[PDB]
Design a protein. Structure first.
Length: 275
């Protein structure tokens, strides 16, 4: 249904227009990049988190208790479902980048590594958007999926229609919004990204959003594909256009991903990435 590449991170230099090709030319829909981060780094970082020895990352952990099991616990305020003012977002964002830099210990640094991937696939500058008064957006959040939890079906271009995105809209292109994530830890089973042939309908509170995509999606039958990247593999895809979810986690070992999103600037002069 959907066309996904599977390449090694050593090869990224050879796909200088991958991001153009996914968003603009629509010539394929996504991409697994193996070994963007070493497995060592991924274990170190996961152990920093589970031991609570994490640069204080735990203090910006949203347990999302009131959602039950169709959502991740998330470290960092994700831009989604935030008030339009963004005071908490921007505060959380400064903390995240600190704790994250600390956990990666430059071996390699998260932001440096990811930016060089996005650079290699665009030939463009890559930046974390800055806010209207010079605040920083978070480059990423960390998603924790315990046993029996999943991420409910959703589509990413919807996010840029929420009040939270007002400011960011003023920076970005019309065009689609990619999703990216790297697993830190993968579960024994489940926790797969399932992507659907079904596209964001531009004709058309994250509680009522999830109940109203569940009935929208179950109206259509459409074709699916599933991906289960390993620790340190990046999955990068047109999650803006295509409905997708993450399947229930099976077994004790939980699923931890670090990820966000990715889009062209106003004039396609550069890439922005955030969560
Ligand atoms: C899981 N997850 C998030 C989104 C999400 C669901 N409840 C939330 C509460 C606060 C902040 C973000 C969320 C999710 C949905 C909107 C259904 C999409 C994926 C993810 C990881 C996005 C950042
Ligand atoms: O697995 C994750 O970290 C989130 C997957 C997803 O739905 C996304 O990145 O948009
Ligand atoms: Cl998404
Ligand atoms: Zn998504």
């Amino acid at each position: 249904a959907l066309h996904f590449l599977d390449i090694n991170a050593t090869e990224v230099k050879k796909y200088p227009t991958a991001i153009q090709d996914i968003i603009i030319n629509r010539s394929f829909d996504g991409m697994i990049i193996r070994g963007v981060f070493p497995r060592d780094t991924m274990e170190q970082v996961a152990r920093c988190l589970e031991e609570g020895n994490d640069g204080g990352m735990k203090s910006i952990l949203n347990k999302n208790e009131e959602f039950g099991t169709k959502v991740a616990q998330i470290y960092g305020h994700a831009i989604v479902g935030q008030s339009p003012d963004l005071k908490d977002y921007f505060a959380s964002s400064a903390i995240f980048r600190q704790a994250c830099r600390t956990m990666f210990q430059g071996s390699p640094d998260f932001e440096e590594q990811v930016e060089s991937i996005f650079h290699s696939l665009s030939g463009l500058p890559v930046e974390i958007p800055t806010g209207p008064e010079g605040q920083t957006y978070t480059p990423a959040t960390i998603r924790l999926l315990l046993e029996g939890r999943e991420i409910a079906v959703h589509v990413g271009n919807d996010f840029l229609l929420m009040p939270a995105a007002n400011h960011l809209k003023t920076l970005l292109d019309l065009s689609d919004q990619l999703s990216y994530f790297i697993p830190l830890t993968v579960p024994e089973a489940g926790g797969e990204l399932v992507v659907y042939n079904l596209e964001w309908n531009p004709q058309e509170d994250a509680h009522k959003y999830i109940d109203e995509v569940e009935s929208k999606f179950k109206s259509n039958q459409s074709q699916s594909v599933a991906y289960a990247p390993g620790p340190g593999d990046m999955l990068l895809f047109n999650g803006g256009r295509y409905y997708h979810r993450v399947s229930e986690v099976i077994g004790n070992s939980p699923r931890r991903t670090i990820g966000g999103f990715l889009a062209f600037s106003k004039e396609r002069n550069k890439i922005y990435y955030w969560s």
